RNA sequence: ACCUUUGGGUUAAGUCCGCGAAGUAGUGAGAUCCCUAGGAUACGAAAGUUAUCGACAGGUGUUAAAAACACAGGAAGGAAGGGGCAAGAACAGGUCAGUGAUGCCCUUAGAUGGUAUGGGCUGCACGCGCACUACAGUGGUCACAGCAGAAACAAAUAGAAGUAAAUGUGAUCGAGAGGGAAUGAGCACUGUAAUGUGCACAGGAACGAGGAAUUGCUAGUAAUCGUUAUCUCAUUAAGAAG
């Protein structure tokens, strides 16, 4: 069954984030404490653990993609998902992508842990990454 | 002070005033013999009830 | 029924140095005799002096508006060079209705009503 | 005079005595009756709602509303 | 085969499809989420509104899945509400006596005709010489 | 024509060749009238907006709506 | 066995006549005959100002050319394909073939 | 601004003057009669004519 | 979630036993139509008295989508009024709905000033307002008072809504809307 | 010379109904055409598409005709909504810098003809027209979701074109933490050539809702919010056209 849809996103993304950090499965980019997520953003994130909320939300994008049986997700797709409206002085605001470097690092970390497999046209889940999510949800709803 | 008379509109006659904003109307008071002619400015339907401040001031032109 | 022929009959007569009036009158007769239900002819330029003008002629029925203009109306334009300048010629012809579809449309105009006779 | 960035002991004491018998109370009341800034009206109000001295009755987006000891709702 | 009907509901450029089926229990899913999990409350309010003018005993022993594409967040909720409304009437006409269909239809028609008929309203095309459908660019004199 | 230019490296002794890219108005002249302005380049037409409107009905374009 | 014949044309009346003619031919041979499939028309368009200079109220026109199309998918033997292809000439309609 | 006009009215009067034995109160009957008795190509015009014929008949 | 009963406003408020309490207004104030959320798309504006059939709190949220920048933000308006009803229900102790009804009743001016003179100069005179116009002006004034009050003041907007509506229902001088109703009626009388 | 005759009702329209020294056919209006909304018995085995059909002031109530309104059923109700086509006459209205369309005057190897390398068209005391961001809290910032018109997206470890945005929930900030103008030393991209564009860091101007005046807009309209496999286009949109 499509088990992921049974719980609310603003409870799931915070929940997994702790399981990640307590096992260090993803490691921060150099200068994560001062870098911005996009050229469209005004200031760096207010939470020091923003890198882990990215990791938690990336696995959610992949779980729902797997649930709906879509084509595999690309680095471009993820960059447009996290995009925003950039401020340009005296000109209309304009839609701009997220920066790729963060996303590339997360996907390469998850590859080394065996959580994400690279296909010829995108990235895909693996059995361990599915089962972690399954066993979390089964407690979390109860 | 809050004196008031309630009156029932029986007829409408003429669109009136600069730009045609008002309507000449015939009104009968609910608890007196008096029947008046008045100008009213909102949309009005026959059989409406309107609240007047005077029972005497009149628009004789009718 | 071909406006592109008649306009070249007109253009010829200008070079033959014949009055526009006589030339146009002849053209209209040819168009009507061949069965056209009407036509329009306009000549424009330095036609009778230093001040330019245009002269327009109408005969019979001509349609200007809507889809019935695209199926019944035919047009041509040409110009003749003379010592004083260029004179422009416009011709338009309204085709006859034709039940075999050779000379013009099979179906008559969309707005015409005809009521059948009784036995 | 400008607003303040502490709730000193004697302001704290009298606020407890004042919050009972008040009905609906909100961020502004603490900041417009007493001299506290918005950033210290939030923190004190959140504290009293953990202590069961007040009770929260709405929290939709940032708009947040509370009730004291002489509140009473409608009845069917 | 299991008793079923299918209906379609439209608002602006949003289109929705509802499938309705026999069940031991009342069940409703939208975007694969139940009413107690779904992330937009305007949708949930518009669903529970129509579910109360129809009697609860008329929605008993029945299951629903709603899918939708196009339009935007407010328009899709009304599109979904029409698709849901037409399913119950369709099922009653096909699988029960026709008097109960007529009874239910009087109640919905008394409440809101736009629950069973679609608004033919759409955006008007832009013309030249103005920013939008009717507004003109600014004329000047001196 | 794709023209070519010589250029020297920093030594001012070794030479290499580079190609000039065809861009701008210089090769996109109107096919009816040689004009450089208002050329419609879509659908591999290369015809100016003045010339287009007189020939459009011969090509087969129509104003439906 | 199978053939798919694309009749492509920038005139509607012609394509309607030629398809009716070919449909009649199909039903007269009676190989379990069927209608053509009406395809999504290709539409190429241009938008331009009317005046040859800057003067006046800027008025604009949209010209669009429509390429209609109809597909027949059909069952025939190779002789009947070779012989019937004699039908597919002297048309303003352009005609194309696919086979398996 | 829904006025039948001179073409429609002329045709309608010719119809009632000659087919009165075939018409009734009903628009749907009257339209079947004009679809037979007349050559009206435009869909909008045959509705205008049949509507005008019913009104004349009842007068 | 919260309830499985009958339809209540915001799922909270009773929606019954409601009185207008001015016979001049009766037909023009819809407190009949049971709706869970003050939102409808019902297309009545294209009709002769269809804007008088729209429900009361609906008319009241529409009044908030103003000052230019807030055009179209109808969700925001609902969020705002929801909170105000909590403040009011608490403060007053009665169905927020009867506060809103009484605010309208008091805040509409009964007599007004207008140009009457046709066949000459236009001379101003008093005139008498219809039922429908009277309520249209009431909403306008209640809204305008709220907007301008909040502009550069530290207080929260839902709180200002509760301040004005109570006072208006109670006919106090404290209401911006009530004061301006007195002004219009005094000037009308001056030109009588 | 010229007029076709008494100016009463109706429509958007000499559109029509009355009445007449006038009467008959036409152009213009309407009809037709194109798009948007409803409709398989056709086609397909994929789940859609297209459709010669459907509305006529037709029904009831309003006591000459033509008409209009108020209800009612109906996908759709008063030109169904929106475009497109579109009389006669005019104007010394605009364009010879669109044209191997063109009369006449002028120049024509020291060219007013071509070509090449550079510079200007982009200069700045100042008066005007049209647009774009604003003056905050019905706000700012962080993160998370999530939805178009439909379907095209090598790779990228700070960052250096792309598949919405308003918006939804939680935090935060607290009354010039609103605002981004002039400017510094940099880091890349397009190009034959930067003067053009992108990016990071500093810097932080006026402006606290606008005098006399003035411009559009009646419903999916105005206003708000983004987007162009549309046009310009090597690179450039604060412009049009969707
Ligand atoms: K001319
Ligand atoms: K202008
Ligand atoms: Mg900003
Ligand atoms: Mg015509
Ligand atoms: Mg007109
Ligand atoms: Mg006559
Ligand atoms: Mg027309
Ligand atoms: Mg001139
Ligand atoms: Mg210049
Ligand atoms: Mg700032
Ligand atoms: Mg330009
Ligand atoms: Zn050209």
**What are the DSSP calls for E29-45, one per residue?**
EETTEETTT-S-HHHHH
Residue whose structure tokens are 């075939």: H22
Q: Which nucleotide is nearest to F37 (CA to C1')?
A: J98
CB E30 within 8 Å of CB E104: no
Task: Report residue I62 CA to chain centroid gap.
Answer: 10
| For chain G, the helix, strand and coil percentages under 3-state DSSP, each to the nearest 5 | 30, 40, 30
Nearest CB partner across the interface for B57, out of I115, I122, I192: I192
Residue A71 per-residue DSSP state: P
A30 CB inside 7 Å of strand J: yes
Please state, in angstroms and rounded to a whole number, the distance separating the CA atoms of residues I181 and I107. 6
3-state SS class at A62: helix
Give C85's strand partners.
C82
| Nearest Cα to Cα of residue G36 among G74, G72, G88, G84 | G72
**Integer distance in angstroms from CA E34 to C1' J167?**
22
Between CA I9 and CA I14, with CA I10 as vertex, the angle to 5 degrees is: 35
- Work out whether the CA dihedral H26, H27, H33, H36 comes out positive or negative: negative
Residue whose structure tokens are 């509409």: I108
Burial (CB < 10 A; 0-12, 13-18, 19+), residue I127, is buried
Please state, in angstroms and rounded to a whole number, the distance separating the CA atoms of residues C6 and F56. 24
Burial (CB < 10 A; 0-12, 13-18, 19+), residue I129, is buried
N-terminal to C-terminal alpha carbon distance within chain H: 22
Reported as type and span, the H/E element at residue D63 is strand D63-67
Please state, in angstroms and rounded to a whole number, the distance separating the CA atoms of residues H26 and H54. 7
Mark E20-49 as b/e (b = at least 16 C-beta within 10 Å): bbeeeeeebbbebbeeebbeeebbbbbbbb
**Integer distance in angstroms from CA A69 to C1' J242?**
35
- Gaps after residue numbers in chain I (C–N over 2.5 angstroms): none
Q: Which nucleotide is nearest to H9 (CA to C1')?
A: J16
List all residues 6 or more positions away from A55 whose beta carbon is below 8 Å from its beta carbon: A17, A20, A25, A26, A106, A109, A110
**Integer distance in angstroms from CA B51 to C1' J61?**
33
| Nearest Cα to Cα of residue A39 among A4, A82, A3, A91 | A82
CA atoms within 13 A on the CB side of C80: 22
Between CA G54 and CA G66, with CA G60 as vertex, the angle to 5 degrees is: 140
Q: Which nucleotide is nearest to E123 (CA to C1')?
A: J220
Please state, in angstroms and rounded to a whole number, the distance separating the CA atoms of residues G79 and G44. 39
Where do the H-state alpha helices sit in C1-119?
3-15, 20-33, 68-72
Quote the tokens at residue B23.
């309507």
Residues in chain F closer than 8 A to G62 (CB atoms)? 63, 65
Burial (CB < 10 A; 0-12, 13-18, 19+), residue I84, is buried
3-state SS class at F13: coil
Residue whose structure tokens are 């109107």: F30
Contact D26/I at CB under 8 A: yes
Please state, in angstroms and rounded to a whole number, the distance separating the CA atoms of residues I154 and I148. 13
Please state, in angstroms and rounded to a whole number, the distance separating the CA atoms of residues E57 and I24. 42
**Ligand 8 mean position, distance from CA G55 (Å):** 13
CA B37 vs CA A2, B27, B59, E28, I152: distances in Å: 75, 6, 5, 62, 48
Angle I157-169/I131-149 helices, nearest 10 degrees? 140
Residue whose structure tokens are 């028309």: G41
Please state, in angstroms and rounded to a whole number, the distance separating the CA atoms of residues G32 and D30. 87
CB I37 within 8 Å of CB I62: no
Between CA E95 and CA E102, with CA E97 as vertex, the angle to 5 degrees is: 110
Phi first, then psi: what are they for G3, rounded to 5°? -140, 145
Contact C113/H at CB under 8 A: yes
* F4 marked among binding-site residues: no
Q: What is the dihedral of CA E26, E32, E33, E38, to 10 degrees?
A: -120
Specified resolution (Å)? 2.8
| Nearest Cα to Cα of residue G78 among G4, G1, G23 | G1
**Ligand 5 mean position, distance from CA C33 (Å):** 37
3-state SS class at I184: helix
CB E137 within 8 Å of CB E127: no
Q: Which residue of I has its CA nearest to E78?
A: I41
| Nearest Cα to Cα of residue E104 among E58, E47, E61, E64 | E58
**Integer distance in angstroms from CA E49 to C1' J137?**
34
Please state, in angstroms and rounded to a whole number, the distance separating the CA atoms of residues G82 and G99. 12
List all residues 6 or more positions away from I28 whose beta carbon is below 8 Å from its beta carbon: I52, I131, I132, I135
CB E37 within 8 Å of CB A11: no
Q: What is the dihedral of CA A3, A7, A11, A14, to 10 degrees?
A: 10
I46 CB inside 7 Å of strand J: yes
G44 CB inside 7 Å of strand J: no
Chains in contact with E, counting 3 or more C-beta pairs less than 8 Å apart as contact: A, G, I
CB I113 within 8 Å of CB I191: yes
Chains in contact with D, counting 3 or more C-beta pairs less than 8 Å apart as contact: I
Mark C36-65 as b/e (b = at least 16 C-beta within 10 Å): bbbbbbbbbbebeeeeeeeeeeebeebbee
The alpha carbon of residue G17 is apart from the nearest alpha carbon of chain F, in Å, by 20
Task: Mark out chain G residues that contact chain E at CB-CB < 8 A.
Answer: 57-60
Please state, in angstroms and rounded to a whole number, the distance separating the CA atoms of residues D4 and I116. 59
| For chain E, the helix, strand and coil percentages under 3-state DSSP, each to the nearest 5 | 40, 20, 40
CA atoms within 13 A on the CB side of G61: 14
CA D1 vs CA D4, D11, D36, D41, D42: distances in Å: 9, 17, 12, 18, 21
| Nearest Cα to Cα of residue I10 among I70, I107, I88 | I88
CB D24 within 8 Å of CB D66: yes
Quote the tokens at residue H40.
């009206």
Please state, in angstroms and rounded to a whole number, the distance separating the CA atoms of residues D43 and D37. 10
């Amino acid at each position: 069954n499509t088990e992921i849809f049974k719980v609310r996103h603003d409870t799931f993304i915070p929940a997994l984030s702790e399981y990640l950090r307590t096992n260090k499965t993803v490691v921060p980019i150099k200068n994560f404490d001062i870098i911005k997520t996009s050229r469209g953003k005004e200031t760096s994130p207010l939470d020091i653990n923003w890198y882990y909320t990215r990791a938690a939300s990336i696995i959610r994008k992949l779980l729902i993609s797997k649930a709906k049986n879509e084509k595999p997700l690309s680095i471009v797709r993820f960059s447009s998902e996290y995009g925003c409206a950039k401020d340009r002085g005296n000109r209309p605001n304009k839609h701009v992508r997220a920066s790729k470097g963060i996303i590339i690092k997360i996907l390469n970390d998850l590859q080394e842990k065996g959580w994400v497999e690279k296909k010829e046209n995108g990235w895909t889940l693996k059995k361990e990454a599915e089962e972690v999510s399954k066993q979390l949800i089964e407690k979390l709803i109860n | 002070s809050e004196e008031v008379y309630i009156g029932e509109v029986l007829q409408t006659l003429e669109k009136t005033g600069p730009g045609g904003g008002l309507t000449m109307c015939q009104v009968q008071l609910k608890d007196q013999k008096r029947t008046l002619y008045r100008a009213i400015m909102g949309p009005i339907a026959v059989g409406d009830l309107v609240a007047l401040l005077d029972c005497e001031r009149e628009h004789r032109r009718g | 029924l071909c406006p592109a022929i008649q306009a070249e009959f007109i253009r010829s007569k200008f070079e033959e140095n014949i009055p526009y009036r006589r030339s146009v009158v002849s053209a209209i007769k040819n168009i009507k005799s061949a069965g056209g239900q009407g036509c329009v002819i306009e000549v424009s330029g330095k036609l009778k002096g230093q001040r330019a003008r245009s002269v327009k002629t109408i005969d019979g029925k001509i349609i200007h508006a809507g889809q019935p203009k695209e199926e019944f109306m035919r047009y041509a334009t040409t110009s003749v060079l003379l010592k004083q300048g260029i004179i422009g010629i416009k011709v338009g012809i309204m085709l006859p209705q034709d039940d075999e579809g050779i000379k013009g449309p099979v179906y008559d105009m969309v707005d015409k009503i005809k009521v059948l006779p009784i036995k | 005079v400008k607003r303040h960035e502490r709730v000193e002991d004697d302001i704290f004491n009298k606020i407890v005595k004042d919050v009972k018998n008040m009905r609906i109370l909100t961020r502004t009341t603490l900041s417009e009756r007493y001299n506290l800034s918005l950033n210290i009206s939030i923190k004190l109000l959140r504290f009293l709602e953990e202590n069961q001295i007040i009770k929260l009755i709405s929290s939709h987006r940032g708009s947040k509303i509370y009730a004291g000891s002489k509140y009473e709702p409608l009845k069917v | 085969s299991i008793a079923q009907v299918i209906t379609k509901g439209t608002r602006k450029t949003a289109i929705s499809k509802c499938v309705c089926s026999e069940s031991n229990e009342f069940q409703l899913m939208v975007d694969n989420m139940t009413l107690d999990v779904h992330h937009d409350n305007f949708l949930v309010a518009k669903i529970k509104e129509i579910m109360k003018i129809i009697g609860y005993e008329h929605l008993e022993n029945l299951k629903f899945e709603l899918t939708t594409r196009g339009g935007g967040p407010i328009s899709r909720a009304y599109a979904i509400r029409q698709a849901f409304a037409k399913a119950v009437i369709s099922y009653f006409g096909k699988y029960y006596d026709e008097q109960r269909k007529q009874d239910i239809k009087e109640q919905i028609m008394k409440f809101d005709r736009a629950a069973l008929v679609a608004d033919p309203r759409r955006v008007e095309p832009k013309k030249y010489g103005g920013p939008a459908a009717r507004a003109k660019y600014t004329k000047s004199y001196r | 024509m794709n023209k070519q230019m010589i250029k020297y490296n920093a030594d001012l002794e070794t030479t290499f060749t580079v190609e000039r890219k065809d861009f701008g108005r210089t090769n996109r002249r109107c096919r009816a009238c040689f004009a450089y302005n208002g050329v419609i380049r879509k659908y591999d037409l290369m015809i100016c907006r003045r010339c287009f409107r007189e020939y459009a009905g011969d090509i087969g374009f129509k104003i439906y709506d | 066995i199978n053939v798919e014949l694309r009749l492509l044309c920038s005139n509607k009346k012609l394509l309607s006549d030629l398809s009716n003619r070919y449909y009649n031919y199909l039903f007269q041979n009676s190989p379990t005959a069927k209608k053509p499939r009406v395809l999504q028309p290709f539409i190429c368009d241009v938008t331009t100002r009317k005046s040859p200079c800057g003067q006046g109220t800027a008025t604009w026109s949209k010209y669009k050319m429509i390429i209609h199309g109809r597909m027949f998918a059909l069952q025939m033997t190779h002789q009947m394909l070779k012989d019937s292809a004699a039908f597919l000439q002297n048309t303003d309609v352009e005609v194309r073939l696919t086979l398996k | 601004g829904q006025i039948k006009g001179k073409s429609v009215r002329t045709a309608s009067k010719v119809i009632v003057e000659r087919y009165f034995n075939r018409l009734t109160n009903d628009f749907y009957d009257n339209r079947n009669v004009v679809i037979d008795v007349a050559e009206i190509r435009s869909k909008k015009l045959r509705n205008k004519v049949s509507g005008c014929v019913t009104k004349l008949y009842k007068r | 979630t919260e309830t499985s009963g009958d339809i209540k406003l915001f799922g909270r408020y009773p929606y019954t036993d409601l009185e207008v309490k001015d016979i001049t207004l009766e037909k023009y104030i819809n407190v009949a139509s049971k709706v869970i959320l003050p939102h409808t798309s019902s297309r009545l504006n294209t009709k002769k008295f269809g804007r008088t059939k729209i429900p009361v709190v609906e008319r009241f949220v529409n009044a908030m989508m103003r000052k230019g920048r807030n055009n179209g933000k109808k969700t925001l308006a609902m969020r705002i009024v929801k909170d105000a009803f909590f403040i009011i229900e608490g403060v007053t102790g009665q169905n927020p709905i009867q506060i809103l009804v009484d605010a309208i009743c008091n805040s509409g001016p009964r007599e007004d000033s207008a140009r009457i003179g046709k066949g000459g100069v236009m001379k101003r005179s008093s005139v008498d307002v219809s039922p429908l116009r009277r309520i249209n002006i009431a909403i306008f004034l209640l809204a305008k008072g709220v907007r301008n009050s909040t502009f550069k003041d530290i207080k929260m907007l839902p709180e200002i809504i509760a301040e004005e509506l109570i006072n208006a229902a109670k006919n106090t001088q404290s209401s911006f809307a009530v004061k301006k109703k007195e002004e219009i009626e005094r000037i009308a009388k001056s030109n009588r």
